[PDB]
Structure 1
Amino acid sequence: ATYLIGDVHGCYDELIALLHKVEFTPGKDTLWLTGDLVARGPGSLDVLRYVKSLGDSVRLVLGNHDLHLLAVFAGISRNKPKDRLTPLLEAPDADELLNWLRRQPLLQIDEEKKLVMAHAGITPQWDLQTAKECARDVEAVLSSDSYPFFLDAMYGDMPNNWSPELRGLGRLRFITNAFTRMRFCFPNGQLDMYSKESPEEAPAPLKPWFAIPGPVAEEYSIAFGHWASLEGKGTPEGIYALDTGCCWGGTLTCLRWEDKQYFVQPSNR
């Protein structure tokens, strides 16, 4: 069976309870994770250890907090106490865990299930071949010996319009923002990087990226996390928002793909 779970954010206990609820069995089942495995919750270290241990039984995409963790680890960004990352950073296996984490994809594709996963979704300005190429570009940087310079470069909110003619840092920054930070678009598909509220609270003419017909969404289902104030609701058919804010005291949600059956685990507050 195929299980998809949204942003875990270090909520290891809830993760394990949800997986026991479905009798998740490595070797017979596969787990898809939308990213943001770490930060806010208390068990980032345990989460990373367990997910890494699953090997081929897990298909992960990196989110924005995974990338921030990598930036703290390389000395690029400052650690926030609120992120609760110090046990993970001071772990004796920190190097192993994080060199594994930076080698994971930004994008997961399963042709037989017609299923695409990215942390934030798929911008409507992209077709599938382009999404793939951009994922491969950023992934090559992340898994190279020079990933700290990339992490330093990734911060920024422009450019917000895609073009195959984009180059260098602007290209990397747009790819990163589209995959890990996207929520609302302008009618032409151009990215907005300031509104994090629910679709009903955003001012016109902003709409969710998925309310704009895009070539990928026309042929594929798309699962994603990241956008907690969506609360998993309001998506069109074929769009699955899996982040229900477990680390914020909401719930951790698991979707079984074969029957589209939802299983939910309350936050441990």
Structure 2
Amino acid sequence: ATYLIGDVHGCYDELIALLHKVEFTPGKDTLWLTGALVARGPGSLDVLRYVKSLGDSVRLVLGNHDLHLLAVFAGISRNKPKDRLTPLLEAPDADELLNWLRRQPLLQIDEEKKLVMAHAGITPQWDLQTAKECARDVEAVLSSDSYPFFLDAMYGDMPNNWSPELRGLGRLRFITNAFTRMRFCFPNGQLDMYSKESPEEAPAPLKPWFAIPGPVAEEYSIAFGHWASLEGKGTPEGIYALDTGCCWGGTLTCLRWEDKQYFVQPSNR
């Protein structure tokens, strides 16, 4: 079977309970994770240890809080007490864990299921070929020995309109924002990096990135996390918003792909 779970945010207990709910068996089943494995929740260390131990039985994409952890670790950015990342940063095996984490993809594609995964989704301004190229570039930087220079370069809210002519730092910033931070779009598909509310309560003319016809979403189903205020509701057919806000007191949501069956684990705090 194939299982997809949204943003875990250090919620190790809920993750293990939900996987036992569905009898997840490595070797016979596959797990897809929308990223943001760490922060806010109490068990970032345990979550990373376990996901890493799964080996090929998991398909992960990195989110913004994974990148932020990578940036704190490399001394690029400062530790926020609210993240609760200190046990993980101080662990004896922290090197193994984060060096593994930075090698993971931004994008997962399964051709047989016609299924795509990224932390925040796929901008309507990208076709599949372009999304693949951009994922490759950023993953190459992230897995290189010079990853802290990229992590430092990544912070930024511009440019927010994709063009194949973007070069250098602008191109990297836009890729990273599209994959890990995107929420609302302007009618031309340009990213808005400020609105974080639900679609009903957003200002005009902002529209959810998935409310805009794009080449990828016309041929593929898209699963994603990141946008908790969405609450997993109100998406069009073929769009799966799996982030139900576990670390915030919501739920951890798991979707079994074969029959599209949902399983939900209540938040412990």
Deviation at 1:135, TM superposition (A): 0.2
What does 1:1-269 correspond to in 2, within 5 Å? 1-269=1-269
Deviation at 1:44, TM superposition (A): 0.1
Cα distance in 2 between the residues matched to 1:164 and 1:52? 35
Paired residue secondary structure (1:32): strand
Deviation at 1:5, TM superposition (A): 0.1
Deviations 1:111-169 (A, max 9, x none): 00000000000000000000000000000000000000000010000000000110000
Deviations 1:8-30 (A, max 9, x none): 00000000000000000000000
Cα distance in 2 between the residues matched to 1:161 and 1:254? 33
Deviations 1:185-216 (A, max 9, x none): 00000000000000011111000000000000
Deviations 1:70-126 (A, max 9, x none): 000000000011100000000000000000000000000000000000000000000
Identity %: 100
Paired residue secondary structure (1:120): coil
Unpaired segments of 5 or more residues in structure 2? none
Deviation at 1:173, TM superposition (A): 0.1
Cα distance in 2 between the residues matched to 1:64 and 1:82? 15
Task: Provide TM-score, normalisation by structure 2.
Answer: 1.00
Name the Cα RMSD after superposition.
0.3
Deviation at 1:54, TM superposition (A): 0.3
Instruction: State the aligned residue count.
Output: 269
Cα distance in 1 between the residues matched to 2:133 and 2:152? 22
Task: Provide TM-score, normalisation by structure 1.
Answer: 1.00
Unpaired segments of 5 or more residues in structure 1? none
Cα distance in 2 between the residues matched to 1:169 and 1:202? 30
Paired residue secondary structure (1:178): helix
Deviation at 1:235, TM superposition (A): 0.2
Paired residue secondary structure (1:200): helix
